[PDB]
Amino acid sequence: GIEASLLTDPKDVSGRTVDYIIAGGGLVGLTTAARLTENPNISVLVIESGSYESDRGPIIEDLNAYGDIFGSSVDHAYETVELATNNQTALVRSGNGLGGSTLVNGGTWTRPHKAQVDSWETVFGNEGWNWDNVAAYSLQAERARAPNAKQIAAGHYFNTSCHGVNGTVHAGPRDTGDDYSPIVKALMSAVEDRGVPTKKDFGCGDPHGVSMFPNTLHEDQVRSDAAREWLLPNYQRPNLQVLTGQYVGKVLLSQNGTTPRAVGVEFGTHKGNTHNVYAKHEVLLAAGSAVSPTILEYSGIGMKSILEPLGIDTVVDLPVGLNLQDQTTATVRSRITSAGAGQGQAAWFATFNETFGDYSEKAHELLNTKLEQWAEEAVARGGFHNTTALLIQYENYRDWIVNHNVAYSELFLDTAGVASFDVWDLLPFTRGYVHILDKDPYLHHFAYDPQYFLNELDLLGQAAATQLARNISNSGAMQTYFAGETIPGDNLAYDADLSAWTEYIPYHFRPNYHGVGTCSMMPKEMGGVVDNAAKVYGVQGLRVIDGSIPPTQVSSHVMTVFYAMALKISDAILEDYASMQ
Ligand SMILES: Cc1cc2nc3c(=O)[nH]c(=O)nc-3n(C[C@H](O)[C@H](O)[C@H](O)COP(=O)(O)OP(=O)(O)OC[C@H]3O[C@@H](n4cnc5c(N)ncnc54)[C@H](O)[C@@H]3O)c2cc1C
Numbered sequence: 001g002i003e004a005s006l007l008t009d010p011k012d013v014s015g016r017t018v019d020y021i022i023a024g025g026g027l028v029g030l031t032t033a034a035r036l037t038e039n040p041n042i043s044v045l046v047i048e049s050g051s052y053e054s055d056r057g058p059i060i061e062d063l064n065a066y067g068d069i070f071g072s073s074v075d076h077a078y079e080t081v082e083l084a085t086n087n088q089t090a091l092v093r094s095g096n097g098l099g100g101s102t103l104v105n106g107g108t109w110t111r112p113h114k115a116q117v118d119s120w121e122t123v124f125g126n127e128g129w130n131w132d133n134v135a136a137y138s139l140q141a142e143r144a145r146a147p148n149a150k151q152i153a154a155g156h157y158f159n160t161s162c163h164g165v166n167g168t169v170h171a172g173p174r175d176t177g178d179d180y181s182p183i184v185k186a187l188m189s190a191v192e193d194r195g196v197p198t199k200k201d202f203g204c205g206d207p208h209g210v211s212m213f214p215n216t217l218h219e220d221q222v223r224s225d226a227a228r229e230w231l232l233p234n235y236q237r238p239n240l241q242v243l244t245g246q247y248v249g250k251v252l253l254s255q256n257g258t259t260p261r262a263v264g265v266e267f268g269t270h271k272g273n274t275h276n277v278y279a280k281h282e283v284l285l286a287a288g289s290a291v292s293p294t295i296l297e298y299s300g301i302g303m304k305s306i307l308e309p310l311g312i313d314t315v316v317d318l319p320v321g322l323n324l325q326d327q328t329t330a331t332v333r334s335r336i337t338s339a340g341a342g343q344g345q346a347a348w349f350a351t352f353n354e355t356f357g358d359y360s361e362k363a364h365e366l367l368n369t370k371l372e373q374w375a376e377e378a379v380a381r382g383g384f385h386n387t388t389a390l391l392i393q394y395e396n397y398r399d400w401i402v403n404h405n406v407a408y409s410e411l412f413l414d415t416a417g418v419a420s421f422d423v424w425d426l427l428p429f430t431r432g433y434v435h436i437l438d439k440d441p442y443l444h445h446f447a448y449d450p451q452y453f454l455n456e457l458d459l460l461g462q463a464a465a466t467q468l469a470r471n472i473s474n475s476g477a478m479q480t481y482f483a484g485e486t487i488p489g490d491n492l493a494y495d496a497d498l499s500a501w502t503e504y505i506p507y508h509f510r511p512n513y514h515g516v517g518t519c520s521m522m523p524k525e526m527g528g529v530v531d532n533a534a535k536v537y538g539v540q541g542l543r544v545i546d547g548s549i550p551p552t553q554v555s556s557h558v559m560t561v562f563y564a565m566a567l568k569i570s571d572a573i574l575e576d577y578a579s580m581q
């Protein structure tokens with residue numbers, strides 16, 4: 001089976017040459033490996049820290065066991081710095097194994113607002129990265145199933161024109177085999193009372209209001225992790241090799257002629273027991289947004305003000321590890337009546353005004369007047385290096401909000417015996433960083449600082465969104481089932497105002513684990529690390545292709561984006577292969 005095919009001994013590859021080395025066998029890594037190896041003459045080696053997990057059992061395969069895997073060997077559990085918002089360390093869940101974070105995630109399959117992806121071309125100068133182009137790739141990756149009568153009656157709506165049916169990633173309604181909870185329709189009715197839409201297909205381009213959604217699972221409900229979807233069908237390809245249990249530590253650079261060329265990687269599990277393997281064509285970094293930037297830094301590709309004090313020679317000076325964009329999540333949970341019983345998830349994608357309610361005018365005043373101050377402050381905190389280019393990102397967000405009314409927050413509802421919202425401000429203005437703190441890759445000593453709540457509007461937005469989830473949990477049809485709040489519950493007066501919520505929130509949140517931007521795809525002069533083909537600036541035969549690369553957040557779950565971008569980048573790669581045969 002697949003297990004017997006996987007390599008575990010470094011000696012099997014040490015000193016050898018393949019066409020492409022992919023660091024990280026996660027979402028993008030395996031999708032790309034599969035696409036590239038469709039040409040039998042193209043050799044690919046995937047190097048993954050973890051191992052195969054897809055047949056472990058429900059802790060991986062059942063999405064309703066979400067979270068049980070946290071803390072295990074399948075969770076990197078990356079620790080943040082001591083955060084300035086609350087003087088505590090936070091844990092960033094991140095999948096360790098073939099499939100990466102697809103092994104541990106919530107399976108939610110939704111797309112951004114069209115204006116967000118369009119702006120990657122029109123504001124960030126990434127030619128051809130507009131909604132229509134990327135959506136073509138997303139449709140191609142997708143193998144969606146329409147809902148049945150029961151799933152529709154629960155609240156599903158599926159636009160046949162917005163889903164591919166013949167692709168690779170299996171997606172369809174979550175259905176545990178219970179009856180569906182009326183709470184999902186109750187939430188729809190409550191927001192409909194306030195003029196908010198419902199049942200909009202969150203895969204069509206306008207994610208707004210309260211809807212259900214597909215999940216990344218097979219019809220039989222097995223998790224469609226990236227390994228199950230892209231590796232398991234294809235592992236018998238002799239041109240596709242996968243080494244497990246090893247970390248890529250750095251990219252090997254040959255400094256001929258005017259520019260450095262990536263010629264391979266070093267890999268291992270501890271200093272002093274490493275090996276090299278070489279790439280004839282390219283090295284491709286896909287170790288995740290927390291990790292691929294550090295791999296560049298260990299290699300001498302990063303900021304001189306970071307690398308030099310650590311004793312690393314800066315071979316290419318780039319703002320690697322800046323522009324880190326993760327969201328904050330908080331919880332509102334209530335007990336329900338017995339009549340609320342049943343399965344179901346849904347989410348409110350809430351606009352800026354829906355989020356802020358009566359604070360709207362004031363929040364808009366901040367958005368209109370403080371952008372330059374905020375960018376200056378974020379730059380002074382080391383979240384970004386160029387104030388002008390950050391101000392552009394911020395004017396972009398304010399264009400999204402004011403001229404396109406994009407979803408600003410997400411109130412994610414779970415049912416199955418409670419009414420529980422996990423709530424996050426989708427569009428943080430804060431910018432953080434990740435940087436190495438030692439030169440030994442295998443020590444894994446790094447400062448990952450998302451700078452949660454260090455921008456005032458992010459704290460105000462989060463507070464308003466979480467307050468709104470309490471509000472909506474006991475409004476309209478929701479009052480049919482509401483049987484008392486259990487979180488915050490006694491920890492925060494039920495009549496708390498917005499200031500009281502801003503005081504509570506820094507002590508009651510978690511990372512959302514949606515971190516992007518650490519090797520941003522945008523022009524070099526805007527602070528970018530890669531071009532519109534994901535090539536690292538000033539290095540030949542080196543790409544960063546994973547969640548490090550999106551220059552902005554999106555009002556979406558990211559899988560749809562990341563499978564699309566993997567395939568799009570894979571075409572660019574294959575075009576270069578065909579050009580230099
Ligand atoms: C808890 C959680 C819940 C989520 N929920 C959802 C959801 O409901 N919907 C949705 O769309 N998205 C969700 N996501 C996001 C999505 O899962 C990730 O954004 C996506 O998997 C990232 O793709 P990637 O290829 O960038 O990195 P990953 O998929 O993280 O892959 C990176 C891979 O590299 C490996 N690795 C790390 N360091 C090294 C190294 N030095 N050498 C070799 N290999 C290395 C890792 O072990 C991992 O396998 C969630 C994420 C998390 C953590």
Ligand SMILES: *[C@@H]1O[C@H](CO)[C@@H](O[C@@H]2O[C@H](CO)[C@@H](O[C@@H]3O[C@H](CO[C@H]4O[C@H](CO)[C@@H](O)[C@H](O)[C@@H]4O)[C@@H](O)[C@H](O)[C@@H]3O)[C@H](O)[C@H]2NC(C)=O)[C@H](O)[C@H]1NC(C)=O
Binds near residue numbers: 084085086087
């Ligand atoms: C996380 O922990 C931090 C400490 O590790 C907290 O920071 C400290 O917070 C206290 C208040 O709780 C501040 O103390 C005040 O200091 C000012 C004057 O500050 C100025 O003078 C000193 C003297 O050299 C200088 O260090 C400062 O930078 C200022 O220039 C007094 O006027 C106050 O009455 C009070 O004493 C600390 O200054 C501050 N920083 C430290 C100790 O380095 C921080 O608030 C904690 N964060 C959270 C969310 O809890």
Ligand SMILES: *[C@@H]1O[C@H](CO)[C@@H](O)[C@H](O)[C@H]1NC(C)=O
Binds near residue numbers: 159160161201
């Ligand atoms: C279905 O998708 C098509 C094509 O994008 C779009 O034209 C139409 O408005 C959608 N209808 C609904 C109700 O989503």
Ligand SMILES: *[C@@H]1O[C@H](CO)[C@@H](O)[C@H](O)[C@H]1NC(C)=O
Binds near residue numbers: 361405
């Ligand atoms: C949002 O609220 C402001 C008032 O605070 C109003 O000027 C604006 O038109 C509203 N925007 C939308 C998209 O409804």
Ligand SMILES: *[C@@H]1O[C@H](CO)[C@@H](O)[C@H](O)[C@H]1NC(C)=O
Binds near residue numbers: 386388389524525527
């Ligand atoms: C800073 O950003 C602006 C906007 O992108 C750009 O015009 C300028 O070239 C950048 N500064 C540097 C030093 O490149």
